[PDB]
Amino acid sequence: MAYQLYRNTTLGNSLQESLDELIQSQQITPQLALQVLLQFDKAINAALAQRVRNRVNFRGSLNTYRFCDNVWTFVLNDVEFREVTELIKVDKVKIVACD
Amino acid sequence: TNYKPVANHQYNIEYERKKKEDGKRARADKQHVLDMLFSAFEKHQYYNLKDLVDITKQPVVYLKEILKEIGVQNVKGIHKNTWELKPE
Amino acid sequence: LDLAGPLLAFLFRGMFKNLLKEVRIYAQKFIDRGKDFNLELAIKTRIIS
Amino acid sequence: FGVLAKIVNYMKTRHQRGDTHPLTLDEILDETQHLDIGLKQKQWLMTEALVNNPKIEVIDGKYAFKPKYNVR
Amino acid sequence: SGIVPQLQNIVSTVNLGCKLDLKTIALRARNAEYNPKRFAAVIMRIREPRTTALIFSSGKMVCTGAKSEEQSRLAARKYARVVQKLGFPAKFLDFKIQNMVGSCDVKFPIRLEGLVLTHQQFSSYEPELFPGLIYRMIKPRIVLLIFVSGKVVLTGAKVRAEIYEAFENIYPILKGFRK
Amino acid sequence: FIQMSVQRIVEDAPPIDLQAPPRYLLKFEQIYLSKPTHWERDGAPSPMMPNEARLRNLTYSAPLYVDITKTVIKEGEEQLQTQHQKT
Amino acid sequence: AQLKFFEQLDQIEKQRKDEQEREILQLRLKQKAKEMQQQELAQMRQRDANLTALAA
Amino acid sequence: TVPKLYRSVIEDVINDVRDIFLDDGVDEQVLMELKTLWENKLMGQVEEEPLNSEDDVSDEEGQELFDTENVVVCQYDKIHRSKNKWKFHLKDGIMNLNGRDYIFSKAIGDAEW
Numbered sequence: 001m002a003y004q005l006y007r008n009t010t011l012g013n014s015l016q017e018s019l020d021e022l023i024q025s026q027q028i029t030p031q032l033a034l035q036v037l038l039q040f041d042k043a044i045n046a047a048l049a050q051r052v053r054n055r056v057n058f059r060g061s062l063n064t065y066r067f068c069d070n071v072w073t074f075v076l077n078d079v080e081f082r083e084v085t086e087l088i089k090v091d092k093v094k095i096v097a098c099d
Numbered sequence: 100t101n102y103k104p105v106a107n108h109q110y111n112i113e114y115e116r117k118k119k120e121d122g123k124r125a126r127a128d129k130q131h132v133l134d135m136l137f138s139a140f141e142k143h144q145y146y147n148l149k150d151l152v153d154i155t156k157q158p159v160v161y162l163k164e165i166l167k168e169i170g171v172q173n174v175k176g177i178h179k180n181t182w183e184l185k186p187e
Numbered sequence: 188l189d190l191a192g193p194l195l196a197f198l199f200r201g202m203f204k205n206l207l208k209e210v211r212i213y214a215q216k217f218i219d220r221g222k223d224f225n226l227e228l229a230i231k232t233r234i235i236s
Numbered sequence: 237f238g239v240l241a242k243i244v245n246y247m248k249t250r251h252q253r254g255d256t257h258p259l260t261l262d263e264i265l266d267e268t269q270h271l272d273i274g275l276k277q278k279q280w281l282m283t284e285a286l287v288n289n290p291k292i293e294v295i296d297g298k299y300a301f302k303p304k305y306n307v308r
Numbered sequence: 309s310g311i312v313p314q315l316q317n318i319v320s321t322v323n324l325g326c327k328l329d330l331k332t333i334a335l336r337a338r339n340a341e342y343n344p345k346r347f348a349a350v351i352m353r354i355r356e357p358r359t360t361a362l363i364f365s366s367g368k369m370v371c372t373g374a375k376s377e378e379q380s381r382l383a384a385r386k387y388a389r390v391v392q393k394l395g396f397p398a399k400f401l402d403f404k405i406q407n408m409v410g411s412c413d414v415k416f417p418i419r420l421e422g423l424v425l426t427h428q429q430f431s432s433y434e435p436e437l438f439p440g441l442i443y444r445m446i447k448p449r450i451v452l453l454i455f456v457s458g459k460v461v462l463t464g465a466k467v468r469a470e471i472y473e474a475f476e477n478i479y480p481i482l483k484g485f486r487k
Numbered sequence: 488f489i490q491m492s493v494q495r496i497v498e499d500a501p502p503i504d505l506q507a508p509p510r511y512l513l514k515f516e517q518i519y520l521s522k523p524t525h526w527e528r529d530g531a532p533s534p535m536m537p538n539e540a541r542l543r544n545l546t547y548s549a550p551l552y553v554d555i556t557k558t559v560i561k562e563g564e565e566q567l568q569t570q571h572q573k574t
Numbered sequence: 575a576q577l578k579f580f581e582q583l584d585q586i587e588k589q590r591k592d593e594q595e596r597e598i599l600q601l602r603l604k605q606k607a608k609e610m611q612q613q614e615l616a617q618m619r620q621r622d623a624n625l626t627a628l629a630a
Numbered sequence: 631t632v633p634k635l636y637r638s639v640i641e642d643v644i645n646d647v648r649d650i651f652l653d654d655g656v657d658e659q660v661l662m663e664l665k666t667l668w669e670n671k672l673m674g675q676v677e678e679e680p681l682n683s684e685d686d687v688s689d690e691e692g693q694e695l696f697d698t699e700n701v702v703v704c705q706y707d708k709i710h711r712s713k714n715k716w717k718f719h720l721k722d723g724i725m726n727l728n729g730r731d732y733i734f735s736k737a738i739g740d741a742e743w
Contacts, residue, residue, distance in 0.1 A: 004623025
């Protein structure tokens with residue numbers, strides 16, 4: 001019942017691995033694990049929407065892009081993420097966007 | 100100052116902007132449309148096509164095709180002949 | 188004795204009732220369509236004139 | 237109960253396959269991506285209520301032969 | 309005349325002869341985008357020909373942006389090959405150049421007012437709607453956008469011969485209205 | 488008639504209520520009347536003398552204008568009030 | 575397990591004691607109506623998660 | 631900073647899953663065990679039908695298969711492109727650059743194709 005964007009990240013992967021361990025131990029049912037994932041998606045969406053109040057900038061070049069079902073899958077190279085406080089350099093990046 | 104020349108009326112441009120931003124309703128897959136229709140019928144026994152189109156968010160022609168496949172039009176003596184989402 | 192004034196007042200009351208009637212109809216169509224309505228376009232001057 | 241009418245639509249497409257065979261509810265629920273818990277029990281109460289009016293024939297044993305007229 | 313129009317964009321349609329899955333093409337293609345709410349086709353872009361192609365589920369495709377006929381044909385073939393590599397039985401059937409656009413400069417200002425007065429039957433000059441005069445040539449079915457700066461843009465041509473013939477026809481007329 | 492009755496009729500005319508959700512209210516407040524005027528084919532207004540009206544078969548009429556306040560309640564807890572002067 | 579059966583009977587009274595308030599009186603009905611609206615958006619919102627996982 | 635936001639997210643997640651754990655009838659110790667393990671884990675061709683006349687007209691498709699490089703997942707408000715450049719109003723989201731995570735609200739991007 002949620003976008004589930006952040007599942008394929010460090011946080012979502014750690015949560016999924018923990019749920020897998022409990023499933024292996026029979027402590028939790030897979031339906032409960034799925035419910036936990038859904039609730040996590042809701043909570044993380046709300047938390048990023050509310051408690052984040054910082055702007056970022058970035059520049060670079062684009063090598064590929066895709067769009068389907070309101071899902072952008074940009075693929076940039078030699079990106080420079082510039083922020084007023086710090087600057088980060090990356091050789092390649094994949095930007096997945098949804099709405 | 101009345102009827103001052105204008106390229107386009109403010110209400111007209113606002114409505115056109117709303118239409119463009121919303122975009123035309125897309126033709127979704129038959130399985131998903133059918134599931135949404137069955138869910139709607141659970142909430143209400145009888146549905147009018149105009150409101151069912153709003154609920155499903157699908158093109159009128161495509162929705163009418165899918166609804167002709169399963170549901171059936173019943174003539175009523177109270178308001179008008181309307182669709183019935185029960186396949187039988 | 189109904190002079191020019193009262194007679195014209197009667198006619199004008201009738202025509203203003205009309206004017207508001209067409210104003211209501213024109214605005215109601217746009218409101219039903221969901222779009223705002225232009226007051227100047229809603230008015231028919233030929234009614235009174 | 238809506239999922240139940242969806243199962244009816246599923247077995248209708250199953251007729252459309254022409255490979256109609258005596259079945260049961262668990263395999264359909266699996267192939268339609270749905271589980272087997274007490275929810276299946278309440279929906280099976282609804283399903284037996286259906287078996288009281290299954291114009292789309294759903295008998296308990298060897299079954300599912302909907303069409304009142306059916307030869308090929 | 310000493311001036312030859314240079315093509316700025318070519319439109320060509322070709323039928324692949326097989327139905328396609330727009331969602332699958334959008335998901336698997338490199339530069340393709342698919343917004344059924346906005347448009348019913350799939351818009352793809354290839355940089356090396358520097359062109360854009362719209363692909364429909366009916367199997368027909370439209371290629372635009374090609375500066376030359378050879379470039380247009382090669383780009384259409386490349387798009388068809390991409391769709392084929394995506395596993396579909398895409399082919400190259402009835403490729404045709406539907407429209408060609410060319411541009412040029414006459415290198416002198418033009419009196420569009422005199423031009424429209426002389427050729428009202430073919431001319432249409434409405435500064436309110438568009439500053440450029442629209443001329444509808446009959447013998448070639450070409451539409452020319454003539455501008456006071458001297459720039460001339462021809463459109464509606466199916467072959468480069470039509471573009472060149474239309475410019476050859478119009479140049480003597482424009483020379484008579486040199487400013 | 489011109490000074491009292493026209494203005495009083497406009498005032499006594501009930502406010503127009505529309506709703507079909509946002510609702511609009513139209514109220515006619517004030518009457519304005521200019522001197523008798525004639526518009527040429529080019530659209531330029533000019534005062535119309537009675538002798539000119541007699542000779543040219545015109546109607547000795549004065550333009551009539553009303554101040555109209557339109558208030559829209561969108562149900563969003565804000566109402567927008569716009570006044571059209573001398574419609 | 576017998577105690578779990580008793581807890582299930584108590585959950586039925588939550589709704590069943592409440593059901594007597596229904597008919598006599600609609601908040602529960604409103605909540606149910608709202609729930610269906612959440613499900614409609616979910617399926618659309620969910621569709622994105624499966625494809626985004628494939629994309630990334 | 632980011633760890634503190636993570637702890638707040640932990641609090642929100644546990645609070646949000648308490649009601650589901652009551653609904654499904656499962657004991658509450660599951661949440662404690664889940665949090666413990668989660669924290670531990672974290673820290674002239676006239677016959678034109680044949681298309682084989684051209685080859686190597688593509689690029690390596692293994693980038694999307696790998697996805698091992700840095701990944702940014704966010705939401706987009708406006709995305710415009712004018713014939714060369716792609717412009718990005720990406721709103722609040724998350725970024726995974728060199729393992730370290732970044733959090734942002736407004737992201738502005740310009741890229742060339």
